Amino acid sequence: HRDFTVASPAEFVTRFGGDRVIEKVLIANNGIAAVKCMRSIRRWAYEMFRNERAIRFVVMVTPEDLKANAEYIKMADHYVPVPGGPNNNNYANVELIVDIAKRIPVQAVWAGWGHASENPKLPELLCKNGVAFLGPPSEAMWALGDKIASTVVAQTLQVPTLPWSGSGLTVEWQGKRISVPEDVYDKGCVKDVDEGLEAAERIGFPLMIKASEGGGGKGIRKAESAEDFPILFRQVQSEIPGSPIFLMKLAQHARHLEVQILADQYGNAVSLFGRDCSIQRRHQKIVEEAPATIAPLAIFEFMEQCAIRLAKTVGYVSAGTVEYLYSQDGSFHFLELNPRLQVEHPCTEMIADVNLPAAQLQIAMGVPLHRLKDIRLLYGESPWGVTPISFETPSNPPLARGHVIAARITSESGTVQELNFRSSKNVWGYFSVQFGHCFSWGENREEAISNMVVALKELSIRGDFRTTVEYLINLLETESFQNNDIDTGWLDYL
């Protein structure tokens, strides 16, 4: 019997064709991200080094989380206390993170999602001091810019987009990542109520007035007529002053689909199927599905392809999501590309057999896609082979294993509680304290759903869940959801 394990991270990098040894990682975050990151990487560590702590971890702990005794602290190998209060004083403080990363020192940082995870200055400052980042590089995020730039880049690449103030704007497109000229970028914004109403009548009401610098429930507004347009436009300005503003046609109740992207530092990028997150309650992804079956496999594959083209073009690295808008008929529209890993990523892990944070870490050490066991197995190749893999036209096109249903849940010392179920054995969850997620697997969608329902029911027993998880059951059992109808209007009269 051959030995597949290696001595140290050093031998691994060498034998797997990487070009950088990371063995000390700093987690710029807390909660379920801090924990999930560590659980996944340590799982991979024990499989590759027979040592769960082969890759060390340092976490930041604010006075709050420290007193509340978050599970992630005792889980970490080392922890550094940071100022409490709003995240700009700690988790979201780029200058602090880069500072701690250097002093220890660590060979890399992981931010996951939330806080400073989407701030290009973080990977920039980290790179400037020789500290790797488990995510896309600053050049790649910059090259993508906000929704304005990215949409121009989307249209440059011929991917559909919803009617917007920038419709039709494209950039002239061997190396070198795409860029959007400051003069082409301005042609997509509106400097006043004048050109605002201009674009408004060209896009048609209802529409959305959004600040690029917007987000977090700010800088956005729904205008349904030209009469209210002015006040609503000025309201967006007063909220996020200085911010470039653009208009976009309001999506007429359709399905929201995401494609899971994964790319190394060699121009190679693959799709790991997608997720279906149409069911939402007040801008909240309530129920999610893996993979997305509502849309024809043929149409979804194309969406994967456009997502990979978009990724390769901005020189993306690591993991990221491309959100699309699939309509009842058969049309889809690019919405955005999340330059980070998401909270509901386990869905993909479960149907593709890919340990994503482990993937990120290996990619950050410079290991190429075809040298990641998980990806090789997904492609029907040898676990530890070395032969190249033709991703464009594979000899064994990957197939997702089963189906996954995920539900966001709410309550009635510790910041993250691990949920287990004696009822269903194919379901696991957690609860941050507020909210949490439950991930149910099944041989097919049908079984995936049944499991979730039993698990949720097993949840209703707990006092903190004798109510909050009742509508999720009712929802999951409604014939409409069962048959997986295209229309999602039934949620309202539930």
Curated annotation (Swiss-Prot):
PTM (free text): The biotin cofactor is covalently attached to the central biotinyl-binding domain and is required for the catalytic activity.
Binding site for Mn(2+) 2: E336, N338
Binding, Mg(2+) 2: E336, N338
Location of the protein in the cell: Mitochondrion
PTM annotation (Phosphoserine): residues: S225
Expression tissues: Widely expressed with highest levels in heart, skeletal muscle, liver, adipose tissue, mammary gland, adrenal gland and colon. Isoform 3 is expressed in skeletal muscle, adipose tissue and liver (at protein level). Isoform 3 is detected at high levels in adipose tissue with lower levels in heart, liver, skeletal muscle and testis.
Every ATP-grasp domain range: 174-365
Modification Phosphothreonine occurs at: T488
Binding site for ATP: G214, G215, G216, G217, K218, G219
Domain of life: Eukaryota
Assembly: Monomer, homodimer, and homotetramer. Forms filamentous polymers. Interacts with MID1IP1; interaction with MID1IP1 promotes oligomerization and increases its activity in a citrate-dependent manner.
Task of the protein: Mitochondrial enzyme that catalyzes the carboxylation of acetyl-CoA to malonyl-CoA and plays a central role in fatty acid metabolism. Catalyzes a 2 steps reaction starting with the ATP-dependent carboxylation of the biotin carried by the biotin carboxyl carrier (BCC) domain followed by the transfer of the carboxyl group from carboxylated biotin to acetyl-CoA. Through the production of malonyl-CoA that allosterically inhibits carnitine palmitoyltransferase 1 at the mitochondria, negatively regulates fatty acid oxidation.
UniProt-recorded name of the protein: Acetyl-CoA carboxylase 2
Source organism per UniProt: Homo sapiens
Lineage, top ranks: Eukaryota, Metazoa, Chordata, Craniata, Vertebrata
Gene: ACACB
Region of the whole protein represented: 239 to 759 of 2458
